[PDB]
Amino acid sequence: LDVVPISNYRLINCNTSAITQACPKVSFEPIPIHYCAPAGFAILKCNDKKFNG
Amino acid sequence: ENLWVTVYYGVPVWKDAETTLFCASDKRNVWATHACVPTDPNPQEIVLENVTENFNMWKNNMVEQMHTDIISLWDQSLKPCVKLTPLCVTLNCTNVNVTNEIKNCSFNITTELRDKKKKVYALFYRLDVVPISNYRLINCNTSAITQACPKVSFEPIPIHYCAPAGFAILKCNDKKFNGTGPCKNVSTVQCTHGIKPVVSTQLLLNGSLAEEEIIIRSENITNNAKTIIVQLNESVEINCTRPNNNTRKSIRIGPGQWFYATGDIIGDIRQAHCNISGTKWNKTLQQVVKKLREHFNNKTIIFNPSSGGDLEITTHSFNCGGEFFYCNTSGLFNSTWIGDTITLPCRIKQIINMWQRVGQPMYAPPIQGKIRCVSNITGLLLTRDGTETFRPGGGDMRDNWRSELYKYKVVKIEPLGVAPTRCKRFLGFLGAAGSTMGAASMTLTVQARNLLSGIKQLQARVLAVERYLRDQQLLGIWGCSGKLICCTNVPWNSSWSNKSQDEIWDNMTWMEWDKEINNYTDIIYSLIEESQNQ
Amino acid sequence: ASMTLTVQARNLLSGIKQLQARVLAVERYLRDQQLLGIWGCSGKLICC
Numbered sequence A: 001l002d003v004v005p006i007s008n009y010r011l012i013n014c015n016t017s018a019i020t021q022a023c024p025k026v027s028f029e030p031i032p033i034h035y036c037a038p039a040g041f042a043i044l045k046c047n048d049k050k051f052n053g
Numbered sequence B: 001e002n003l004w005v006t007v008y009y010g011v012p013v014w015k016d017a018e019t020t021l022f023c024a025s026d027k028r029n030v031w032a033t034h035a036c037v038p039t040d041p042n043p044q045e046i047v048l049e050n051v052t053e054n055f056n057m058w059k060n061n062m063v064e065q066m067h068t069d070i071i072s073l074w075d076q077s078l079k080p081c082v083k084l085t086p087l088c089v090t091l092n093c094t095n096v097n098v099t100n101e102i103k104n105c106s107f108n109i110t111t112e113l114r115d116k117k118k119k120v121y122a123l124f125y126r127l128d129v130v131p132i133s134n135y136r137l138i139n140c141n142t143s144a145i146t147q148a149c150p151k152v153s154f155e156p157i158p159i160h161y162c163a164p165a166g167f168a169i170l171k172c173n174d175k176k177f178n179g180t181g182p183c184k185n186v187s188t189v190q191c192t193h194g195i196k197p198v199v200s201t202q203l204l205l206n207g208s209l210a211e212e213e214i215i216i217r218s219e220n221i222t223n224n225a226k227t228i229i230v231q232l233n234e235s236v237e238i239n240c241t242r243p244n245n246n247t248r249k250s251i252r253i254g255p256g257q258w259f260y261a262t263g264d265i266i267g268d269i270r271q272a273h274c275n276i277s278g279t280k281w282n283k284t285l286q287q288v289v290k291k292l293r294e295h296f297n298n299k300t301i302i303f304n305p306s307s308g309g310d311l312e313i314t315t316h317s318f319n320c321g322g323e324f325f326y327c328n329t330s331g332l333f334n335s336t337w338i339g340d341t342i343t344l345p346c347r348i349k350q351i352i353n354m355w356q357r358v359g360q361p362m363y364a365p366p367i368q369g370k371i372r373c374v375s376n377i378t379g380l381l382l383t384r385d386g387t388e389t390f391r392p393g394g395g396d397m398r399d400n401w402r403s404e405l406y407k408y409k410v411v412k413i414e415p416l417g418v419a420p421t422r423c424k425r426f427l428g429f430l431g432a433a434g435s436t437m438g439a440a441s442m443t444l445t446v447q448a449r450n451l452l453s454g455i456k457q458l459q460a461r462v463l464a465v466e467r468y469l470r471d472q473q474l475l476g477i478w479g480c481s482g483k484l485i486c487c488t489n490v491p492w493n494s495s496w497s498n499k500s501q502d503e504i505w506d507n508m509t510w511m512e513w514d515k516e517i518n519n520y521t522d523i524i525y526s527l528i529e530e531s532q533n534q
Numbered sequence C: 001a002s003m004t005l006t007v008q009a010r011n012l013l014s015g016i017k018q019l020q021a022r023v024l025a026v027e028r029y030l031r032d033q034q035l036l037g038i039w040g041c042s043g044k045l046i047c048c
């Protein structure tokens, strides 16, 4: 899936852009991020069990 | 008798100052990086009655500010695109199929595959190619050539400059005002008019016109070391064209790296040129000379072509539809004055070095089809030789901007001050500046509110807050932390001022008062702080 | 020492790292002033 026919083949993105490899020491495991309010603002939360949106 | 020092805050006075201004303006135009805000759809102008202010366009720091911002916008806009360093190879150039100025060059380039090369052809203008398998691009031995980002036009967008909190921009409205001196009609504005960042070298294009007559502005009309800016009260149209039906060819250099080359030319090869009406040009010169004879004695005045230097200075350059033209103006500056259509041939270049920055060339991609544009000559840049001789010239861009910013001055508001009185313990912003103190003291809230109203903007905002707080801390120390008018118990010294209450309050303005007791402020402020601790 | 309070009060106001330092200095100044306003004597250095 990463190789495309054109001494037979080319990498799939060589005619469109630069491919950057993932930095090898960097994992992709999700870390929970909390979003918090600045001074002057507040975040309100809805607690209705059947609330759809 | 019984006079005491009273502190007033929000007093409509000011002192000259330099600061950071912000833009206001309103795809991907080179001058539209959105680094700054939209305009005010209805900005106000406040006439200051009875205000005389000394202006000096040659000491105006707004010019330096504009020059720097223009360079920055240009450079930011050219960062995200293709460099042409892969093209610095030897070219094989001939003239086999062009004419019975343009060379047909072949060369090798890379492709998206690093192990492959191919031979390609392109047309180049002679001015961009230097002989050494015969030729090299003109800047390959000195720097990297970056092509213009292909989706970015260079058409000027008016930029308004606006004052930060704590500052004001004053405008001079005298019809015959030249570069310096007192202006008897001063208005306060939020922002400047929009100024188009038009780049040109001998004639000024698309600027403002003079209202009554031609105005000749110079720092020193009697020097030879200074330029002369001549503003016309009537425009002269200049019709420029690039008649060759050039085609565009797109060449792949690498992985998403595209180069735009001139392809072949359809039809005849013709020379670029500009058309100026003969009669308007002559009327313009009779008037330019007529007003020049008012500074010069009744001597013969002659005009000659630019005396020397490179193409950027000897010719009139401009950007017309994205192409960079250089035109020969010897057909205009060639005359003697004593007590049909003009055709200027031109040249086109693709590799340019703007604002005299050596080592930073840019390649303008060719533009598909014919180009035509009509511009307004609104002024001239002249110099003098050591009969008086004038020549067109001056490649220093600050002179173009001085022709629009000459009416504006930046001042800093100084809201705190004192005056004696008998107490013991809608005009708009600065509208009261020309009023007497007894009237002006009633608009203090208007100015107090205007003290609060990228890194350079954060620094400006943080500093304005710090200034505000330093004044509030001082008032808290003296007393009356919550008031704009504060009576204290320091008695008034007739030695600071022996003027009567009527002279001070019903005749003098706050500006006059500020000057009158300017050197006692470091005494009075200390006395207030000291009496407070008793 | 209580007679030199203005000397120190004035020295509370007197790149990114400098902007952060200056913004923070302002914020702590204001927090002290807000507190004094809540207690009373918002404009005084000595408050009974």
Ligand SMILES: *[C@@H]1O[C@H](CO)[C@@H](O[C@@H]2O[C@H](CO)[C@@H](O[C@@H]3O[C@H](CO[C@H]4O[C@H](CO)[C@@H](O)[C@H](O)[C@@H]4O)[C@@H](O)[C@H](O[C@H]4O[C@H](CO)[C@@H](O)[C@H](O[C@H]5O[C@H](CO)[C@@H](O)[C@H](O)[C@@H]5O)[C@@H]4O)[C@@H]3O)[C@H](O)[C@H]2NC(C)=O)[C@H](O)[C@H]1NC(C)=O
Pocket (backbone or CB within 6 Å): B027, B153, B155, B156, B198, B205, B206, B318, B319, B320, B321, B322, B367, B368, B372, B373, B374, B375, B376
């Ligand atoms: C002083 O002030 C003068 C007045 O403002 C200036 O003159 C004006 O200068 C501008 C900019 O050069 C001229 O505007 C250009 O006019 C071109 C002519 O098009 C004509 O035909 C069009 C047909 O549809 C019509 O719509 C136009 O109204 C007009 O009749 C335009 O083609 C050109 O368009 C550019 O901007 C477009 C924005 O969307 C863009 O889409 C265009 O793309 C085209 O070209 C590119 C090039 O690669 C192709 O790739 C595209 O596929 C497509 O073909 C193009 O980028 C623009 O509107 C204006 O006409 C002119 N006025 C006069 C009276 O001539 C002076 O220049 C100022 N002086 C100085 C020194 O600056």
Ligand SMILES: *[C@@H]1O[C@H](CO)[C@@H](O[C@@H]2O[C@H](CO)[C@@H](O)[C@H](O)[C@H]2NC(C)=O)[C@H](O)[C@H]1NC(C)=O
Pocket (backbone or CB within 6 Å): A007
């Ligand atoms: C690509 O690799 C293949 C590998 O099989 C090469 O094909 C032949 O491989 C055998 C393996 O024993 C060799 O003995 C042959 O000599 C190879 N052929 C040739 C002509 O040498 C194939 O040639 C390689 N292609 C390229 C471009 O190197």
Ligand SMILES: *[C@@H]1O[C@H](CO)[C@@H](O[C@@H]2O[C@H](CO)[C@@H](O)[C@H](O)[C@H]2NC(C)=O)[C@H](O)[C@H]1NC(C)=O
Pocket (backbone or CB within 6 Å): A004, A015, A016
């Ligand atoms: C880069 O090369 C790839 C592969 O040849 C191109 O992708 C093909 O584009 C055509 C366009 O119609 C499609 O029909 C094919 O199905 C695509 N192939 C694959 C594997 O997706 C791609 O368009 C090329 N990019 C450029 C800029 O030319």
Ligand SMILES: *[C@@H]1O[C@H](CO)[C@@H](O[C@@H]2O[C@H](CO)[C@@H](O)[C@H](O)[C@H]2NC(C)=O)[C@H](O)[C@H]1NC(C)=O
Pocket (backbone or CB within 6 Å): B092, B093, B094, B096, B133
């Ligand atoms: C540069 O291009 C010219 C193009 O004319 C080459 O000159 C000759 O071109 C004719 C065209 O029919 C060929 O038949 C000749 O064989 C070319 N001359 C030679 C000596 O081969 C010229 O040679 C090219 N130069 C380089 C460095 O390639």
Ligand SMILES: *[C@@H]1O[C@H](CO)[C@@H](O[C@@H]2O[C@H](CO)[C@@H](O)[C@H](O)[C@H]2NC(C)=O)[C@H](O)[C@H]1NC(C)=O
Pocket (backbone or CB within 6 Å): B130, B141, B142
């Ligand atoms: C890069 O190459 C150009 C072209 O040879 C050099 O420009 C020439 O410099 C000499 C110096 O005396 C001038 O006399 C020529 O008139 C210049 N030629 C042109 C076309 O302007 C340039 O100096 C070289 N740069 C470096 C760093 O060597």
Ligand SMILES: *[C@@H]1O[C@H](CO)[C@@H](O[C@@H]2O[C@H](CO)[C@@H](O)[C@H](O)[C@H]2NC(C)=O)[C@H](O)[C@H]1NC(C)=O
Pocket (backbone or CB within 6 Å): B045, B046, B047, B173, B185, B186, B187
């Ligand atoms: C002094 O300058 C002001 C502008 O600051 C002039 O006021 C303008 O006058 C024109 C006359 O048609 C009006 O259209 C504008 O709307 C006025 N502008 C403002 C802000 O009021 C004023 O006329 C000038 N006075 C003199 C003696 O030159």
Ligand SMILES: *[C@@H]1O[C@H](CO)[C@@H](O[C@@H]2O[C@H](CO)[C@@H](O)[C@H](O)[C@H]2NC(C)=O)[C@H](O)[C@H]1NC(C)=O
Pocket (backbone or CB within 6 Å): B206, B235, B374, B375, B376
């Ligand atoms: C070139 O100068 C002419 C004449 O001064 C400008 O055309 C007129 O400008 C006035 C300004 O109030 C308008 O009211 C007229 O409607 C304009 N004429 C037309 C036909 O629209 C012209 O706009 C100037 N060109 C540039 C590029 O500034």
Ligand SMILES: *[C@@H]1O[C@H](CO)[C@@H](O[C@@H]2O[C@H](CO)[C@@H](O)[C@H](O)[C@H]2NC(C)=O)[C@H](O)[C@H]1NC(C)=O
Pocket (backbone or CB within 6 Å): B178, B179, B180, B181, B182, B216, B217, B218, B219, B220, B221
């Ligand atoms: C612009 O106008 C000002 C004001 O008239 C000129 O300044 C005067 O220049 C004469 C020259 O001898 C001095 O004696 C006056 O004292 C100057 N007046 C002031 C208020 O300083 C100025 O020279 C003019 N400049 C041009 C290029 O016309």
Ligand SMILES: *[C@@H]1O[C@H](CO)[C@@H](O[C@@H]2O[C@H](CO)[C@@H](O)[C@H](O)[C@H]2NC(C)=O)[C@H](O)[C@H]1NC(C)=O
Pocket (backbone or CB within 6 Å): B220, B221, B222, B223, B224
């Ligand atoms: C404006 O230009 C004139 C002419 O160059 C200056 O006048 C000269 O000033 C120098 C200074 O010492 C004298 O030595 C010359 O003899 C003066 N020449 C004349 C003709 O008087 C004048 O000083 C300049 N003014 C400013 C403000 O720069």
Ligand SMILES: *[C@@H]1O[C@H](CO)[C@@H](O[C@@H]2O[C@H](CO)[C@@H](O)[C@H](O)[C@H]2NC(C)=O)[C@H](O)[C@H]1NC(C)=O
Pocket (backbone or CB within 6 Å): B237, B238, B239, B275, B276, B277, B341, B374
């Ligand atoms: C520059 O081009 C303009 C038009 O774009 C010319 O203006 C026209 O001139 C003819 C001359 O007979 C008039 O009949 C038209 O009515 C004019 N059109 C407009 C809109 O005014 C202008 O003359 C050209 N300038 C030069 C120097 O040739």
Ligand SMILES: *[C@@H]1O[C@H](CO)[C@@H](O[C@@H]2O[C@H](CO)[C@@H](O)[C@H](O)[C@H]2NC(C)=O)[C@H](O)[C@H]1NC(C)=O
Pocket (backbone or CB within 6 Å): B314, B315, B328, B329, B330
């Ligand atoms: C502008 O064009 C004029 C001619 O129309 C050029 O002047 C000529 O320059 C050559 C250079 O060798 C002289 O031999 C001629 O005698 C000059 N002609 C006249 C009438 O003096 C002028 O050099 C060109 N200027 C620019 C900046 O290109």
Ligand SMILES: *[C@@H]1O[C@H](CO)[C@@H](O[C@@H]2O[C@H](CO)[C@@H](O)[C@H](O)[C@H]2NC(C)=O)[C@H](O)[C@H]1NC(C)=O
Pocket (backbone or CB within 6 Å): B305, B330, B334, B335
């Ligand atoms: C300025 O205009 C004059 C007059 O048109 C030009 O004088 C010409 O000079 C050339 C020089 O070789 C003579 O051959 C012509 O016969 C002269 N013209 C006339 C009518 O006698 C002068 O050259 C022009 N200057 C420039 C720089 O072009």
Ligand SMILES: *[C@@H]1O[C@H](CO)[C@@H](O[C@@H]2O[C@H](CO)[C@@H](O)[C@H](O)[C@H]2NC(C)=O)[C@H](O)[C@H]1NC(C)=O
Pocket (backbone or CB within 6 Å): B245, B266, B369, B370
């Ligand atoms: C420059 O020439 C081209 C081609 O001669 C003109 O554009 C069109 O090109 C297509 C290509 O297939 C032709 O089918 C069209 O008939 C051409 N248009 C016209 C009106 O002939 C292009 O317009 C020319 N440019 C100019 C400014 O004349």
Ligand SMILES: *[C@@H]1O[C@H](CO)[C@@H](O[C@@H]2O[C@H](CO)[C@@H](O)[C@H](O)[C@H]2NC(C)=O)[C@H](O)[C@H]1NC(C)=O
Pocket (backbone or CB within 6 Å): B048, B049, B050, B431, B432, B434, B435, B436
């Ligand atoms: C500018 O000065 C004029 C007078 O020099 C001021 O006009 C006076 O305004 C007062 C206001 O009550 C009137 O009582 C006087 O009768 C006016 N004098 C004249 C001669 O009409 C004018 O108000 C001043 N401008 C400002 C903003 O205060």
Ligand SMILES: *[C@@H]1O[C@H](CO)[C@@H](O)[C@H](O)[C@H]1NC(C)=O
Pocket (backbone or CB within 6 Å): A005, A006, A007, A008, A009
């Ligand atoms: C690889 O090259 C050989 C050489 O003939 C060809 O037969 C084969 O079909 C090619 N394969 C691809 C994917 O191009």
Ligand SMILES: *[C@@H]1O[C@H](CO)[C@@H](O)[C@H](O)[C@H]1NC(C)=O
Pocket (backbone or CB within 6 Å): B090, B091, B092, B106, B107, B108, B119, B133
């Ligand atoms: C381009 O590369 C080929 C490779 O053989 C060479 O023969 C040709 O002369 C090169 N072209 C130029 C203009 O150097």
